[PDB]
Amino acid sequence: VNSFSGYLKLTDNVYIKNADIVEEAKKVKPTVVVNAANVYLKHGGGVAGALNKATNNAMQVESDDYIATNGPLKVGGSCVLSGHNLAKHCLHVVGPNVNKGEDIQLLKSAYENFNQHEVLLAPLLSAGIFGADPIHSLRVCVDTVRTNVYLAVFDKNLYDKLVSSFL
Ligand SMILES: N#Cc1ccc(N2CCC[C@@H](C(=O)Nc3nccs3)C2)nc1
């Protein structure tokens, strides 16, 4: 039993809700919140910009030190950093950005990072400003993630479409 509330159950391990991931994280304080990161951990917009703003830019300060030490992530890769005031940990995961021409096949590799954590609050990878089809992202999530994932979908119209079209 966990503290996530109001989710629709899609499969044995995948759950979904129309919710602002920032507000959901502040309420649940999950062990892991997933960020829709880029390889530079530059949290300018989309989910990343919103999560970072909610940390009062502390996420960005920590991320800049991480990059200065380690260099950029790989597309499809991840790193674990602090969750600040939102969660115990933040798993920064880089899905392919279609608006940069990146290989959509890397979306499965990106979701594989979730399997290293028993429970996660997450957005749909590569959705929103990353330019992928969110219906496809949900399909890859369900077919790749085996741990317990609670998906927050900001847009109510998109949420209803994701549910109604789910096979
Ligand atoms: N692509 C993409 C993408 C972009 C942003 C985003 N969020 C998550 C939910 C909260 C939202 C927020 O802070 N909205 C506000 N409106 C007025 C004042 S603050 C930001 N999610 C996905």
From Swiss-Prot:
Regulation: Inhibited in vitro by GRL-0617.
Membrane topology (UniProt): Multi-pass membrane protein
Signal peptide: none
Superkingdom of this protein's organism: Viruses
Domain (Macro): residue spans on this chain: 1-167
Location(s) in or outside the cell: Host endoplasmic reticulum membrane
Reported effect, residue 31 to A: In strain: Mu/B.1.621
Catalysed conversion reaction: Thiol-dependent hydrolysis of ester, thioester, amide, peptide and isopeptide bonds formed by the C-terminal Gly of ubiquitin (a 76-residue protein attached to proteins as an intracellular targeting signal)
Subunit architecture: May form homohexamers. Interacts with N protein.
Chain's role: Responsible for the cleavages located at the N-terminus of the replicase polyprotein. Participates together with nsp4 in the assembly of virally-induced cytoplasmic double-membrane vesicles necessary for viral replication. Antagonizes innate immune induction of type I interferon by blocking the phosphorylation, dimerization and subsequent nuclear translocation of host IRF3. Also prevents host NF-kappa-B signaling. In addition, PL-PRO possesses a deubiquitinating/deISGylating activity and processes both 'Lys-48'- and 'Lys-63'-linked polyubiquitin chains from cellular substrates.
Name of this protein: Papain-like protease nsp3
Organism: Severe acute respiratory syndrome coronavirus 2 (2019-nCoV)
